[PDB]
Structure formats: C-alpha cells, structure tokens
C-alpha cells in the first residue's frame, strides 16, 4: 500500500 496497492 501507500502508492495504489504498490505492494504494501
């Protein structure tokens, strides 16, 4: 998350 569902 943090950067559209960039992961976490």
Given at each position: ?8
């Amino acid at each position: 998350w943090x950067v559209x569902e960039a992961x976490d």
